[PDB]
Amino acid sequence: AQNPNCNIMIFHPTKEEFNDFDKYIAYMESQGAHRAGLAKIIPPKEWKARETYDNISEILIATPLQQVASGRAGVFTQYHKKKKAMTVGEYRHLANSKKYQTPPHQNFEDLERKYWKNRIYNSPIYGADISGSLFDENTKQWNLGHLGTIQDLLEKECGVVIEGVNTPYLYFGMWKTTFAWHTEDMDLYSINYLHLGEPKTWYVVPPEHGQRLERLARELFPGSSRGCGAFLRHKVALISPTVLKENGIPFNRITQEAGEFMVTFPYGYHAGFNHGFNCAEAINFATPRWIDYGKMASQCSCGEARVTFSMDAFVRILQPERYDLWKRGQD
Ligand SMILES: O=C(O)CNC(=O)C(=O)O
Ligand SMILES: [Mg+2]
Ligand code: NI
Ligand SMILES: [Zn+2]
Known part of the structure; x- marks a missing residue:
């Protein structure tokens, strides 16, 4: 098995290797990248997102x-x-x-x-x-x-x-701006490019150990847990690295700098913060390997997490039993 310790991997594709997105994602997974929940991709030196900001x-x-x-x-x-x-x-x-x-x-x-x-x-x-x-x-x-x-x-x-x-979304951050512990909607992948400015530090739990983080979160946020069986979908809860170490939760950390991509993998819980003024762009995506994760993804039915038009169809097709109760939460 590749990458058995679930370390965050960093990739340096050539301009030739940068032409076929799907194939490069599949390459990274062949090397075990997904086991960490997060990977960094440094674009070829010839590449640019745009001419100036x-x-x-x-x-x-x-x-x-x-x-x-x-x-x-x-x-x-x-x-x-x-x-x-x-x-x-x-x-x-x-x-x-x-x-x-x-x-x-x-x-x-x-x-x-x-x-x-x-x-x-x-x-x-x-x-x-x-x-x-x-x-x-x-x-x-x-x-x-x-x-x-x-x-x-x-x-x-x-x-x-x-x-x-x-479609994609922009994020403009400052010192201390924070993203709470979560996986993506429908346990999708995400890709995030840091266009400019100061760095973003990430923390991630390997997918194979996601349930350990969920059990700690139910202990640490006990009223939230009673209110909703999938409350980390509310994107409100933070737990420090010190606390994770004290409770034996496996995780890793990495800092992304301007000009770099990060990929999060299905069911890889992540959280983090910005070091100063910056601008990132991110979007969800899927591969064939995601389908089974989509079928198993938790859902918020308390009504707090309140999500996109396009997630309707994913739930309807992949989770038809949940359909009904989930749309009661989303209406
Ligand atoms: O950059 C942020 O504030 C949050 N981004 C993500 O959670 C992501 O790209 O999956
Ligand atoms: Mg303008
Ligand atoms: Ni995310
Ligand atoms: Zn909820």
């Missing part, structure tokens, strides 16, 4: 989110308070302000320590989940706006034609 300040962040924490430093929840619209130029200036900017630090490790010690005492503002793309239409390789769609994957593998579309 010089004219992005007029993108609108219609609903910036203030991420307010409750709990203790290593075990907390976050809620998202909606704020007034601002442009990316306005947001970048705010991120750079004395109130919100990255503190002095020695290296990524010292910054990680400061994040876990101090996150709960501040409320950073995240421009998340904005439909759109920063890839130039002429970028032909690994353009997250030109990928094969999950509806077309399901049709190719299973023969059924369904409604829905699949």
Whole structure:
């Protein structure tokens, strides 16, 4: 078995190897990459997502989110308070302000320590989940706006034609902005490109050990657990590396820098934070190996997680028994 310790793998494709997205994903899995839940891909040196970022300040962040924490430093929840619209130029200036900017630090490790010690005492503002793309239409390789769609994957593998579309999303981050512990909708893959700015640190649990993280989360967030059998789909719960180590949960960590891709694999729980002002683009995708994960994916039926138009069809076809109760939650 390849990669039996489930370490995060890093790949350096040539420009020749960068032409066929599906085939490269299948190559990474042949080497065991999926066992970690997360992989890094450094694009060939010849490749670029676009020519410059010089004219992005007029993108609108219609609903910036203030991420307010409750709990203790290593075990907390976050809620998202909606704020007034601002442009990316306005947001970048705010991120750079004395109130919100990255503190002095020695290296990524010292910054990680400061994040876990101090996150709960501040409320950073995240421009998340904005439909759109920063890839130039002429970028032909690994353009997250030109990928094969999950509806077309399901049709190719299973023969059924369904409604829905699949488009990318932009994320504008600042120091301390946080993504809570989750897997993707329907336990899909994700791919994330860091277009610009400061790094993003990731934590991940190997798919084969996901249930260990779920059991710890039920212990640590006991009222949330009683309210919903799939509450990590609410994307609100944080657990520190120290706490994970204390409870014997297998995990790994890595820092993504500007110009790098990350891939998350089906049922790979992940969480993380931004080091400073940055912009990432991400999209879900599928391969033939995902189908069985989609069939087994948990669902939120309490009504909090409230998800896309296109996830309807996935549930209807892959989970027809759940269909009914899940759409009661989504209506
Ligand atoms: O970048 C973020 O805030 C969150 N991204 C992801 O969870 C992802 O790409 O799967
Ligand atoms: Mg602009
Ligand atoms: Ni994700
Ligand atoms: Zn729920």
